[PDB]
Amino acid sequence: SMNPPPPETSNPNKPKRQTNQLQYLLRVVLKTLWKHQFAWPFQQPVDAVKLNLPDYYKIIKTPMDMGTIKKRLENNYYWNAQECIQDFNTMFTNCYIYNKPGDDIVLMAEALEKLFLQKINELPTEE
Numbered sequence: 001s002m003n004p005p006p007p008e009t010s011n012p013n014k015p016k017r018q019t020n021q022l023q024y025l026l027r028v029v030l031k032t033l034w035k036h037q038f039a040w041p042f043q044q045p046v047d048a049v050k051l052n053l054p055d056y057y058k059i060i061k062t063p064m065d066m067g068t069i070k071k072r073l074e075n076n077y078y079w080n081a082q083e084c085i086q087d088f089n090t091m092f093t094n095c096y097i098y099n100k101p102g103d104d105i106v107l108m109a110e111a112l113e114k115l116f117l118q119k120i121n122e123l124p125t126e127e
């Protein structure tokens with residue numbers, strides 16, 4: 001079995017800029033989300049080889065993870081906060097599509113998402 005290449009975290013072809021909202025999202029990742037135990041399955045791309053889930057990248061064609069998101073934020077990859085929020089929602093949706101409701105991984109994703117939603121409710125107005 002083989003993993004796909006991980007999502008890009010730099011792209012000289014893709015427009016980008018620094019904004020106060022994206023700095024907010026970076027510190028949300030670094031200072032609020034990452035530190036919880038429930039984050040550990042989401043801190044890196046799914047290793048379908050190690051997990052013995054050969055179906056994973058058959059089912060999930062838009063993989064995303066918080067390790068990728070953190071790097072994108074650190075690297076100023078995004079043009080706006082909507083792009084970053086979309087990446088979080090892709091990560092959560094993948095988990096909910098792939099796993100049975102009630103599975104521990106779904107509960108972990110829901111804990112992470114609850115915290116995430118609390119923070120994006122307080123997203124600062126863009127400067």
Ligand SMILES: O=C(CCl)Nc1ccc(/N=N/c2ccc(S(=O)(=O)O)cc2)cc1S(=O)(=O)O
Pocket residue numbers: 005006007008011012013
């Ligand atoms: O230096 C430039 C343009 Cl000035 N080239 C470039 C620019 C962007 C690029 N993007 N590559 C990827 C690779 C993977 C994904 S992903 O798996 O969908 O996340 C996205 C973009 C690849 C390349 S390149 O193939 O390495 O030339």
Ligand SMILES: O=C(CCl)Nc1ccc(/N=N/c2ccc(S(=O)(=O)O)cc2)cc1S(=O)(=O)O
Pocket residue numbers: 021080081082083085117120121123124125126
């Ligand atoms: O990217 C920018 C650059 Cl100005 N802005 C942005 C980007 C995303 C955004 N999304 N906010 C939310 C708020 C709540 C949910 S909800 O709880 O899942 O309904 C989703 C997105 C709000 C905004 S904003 O309201 O325009 O600041």
Ligand SMILES: O=C(CCl)Nc1ccc(/N=N/c2ccc(S(=O)(=O)O)cc2)cc1S(=O)(=O)O
Pocket residue numbers: 099100101102103
């Ligand atoms: O097509 C699906 C998802 Cl793959 N239907 C589904 C939907 C929900 C489900 N069971 N969910 C739960 C969730 C929580 C508990 S609990 O921890 O005992 O409260 C039990 C079942 C099982 C299934 S099912 O096992 O696949 O029929």
Ligand SMILES: O=C(CCl)Nc1ccc(/N=N/c2ccc(S(=O)(=O)O)cc2)cc1S(=O)(=O)O
Pocket residue numbers: 096100101102103106107110
């Ligand atoms: O995000 C999701 C799944 Cl994608 N929420 C969800 C949605 C429905 C759900 N259903 N749980 C149950 C629990 C018990 C029964 S019963 O004992 O068979 O009546 C059915 C569904 C469990 C959950 S979950 O346990 O929080 O995953």
Ligand SMILES: O=C(CCl)Nc1ccc(/N=N/c2ccc(S(=O)(=O)O)cc2)cc1S(=O)(=O)O
Pocket residue numbers: 040041042044045046047048050051103104105106
């Ligand atoms: O570290 C990587 C490689 Cl870039 N990926 C990864 C990604 C997720 C993961 N664990 N995922 C799950 C899935 C389901 C459950 S369960 O529902 O509680 O059984 C737990 C962890 C394990 C791993 S792994 O152990 O490191 O292979």
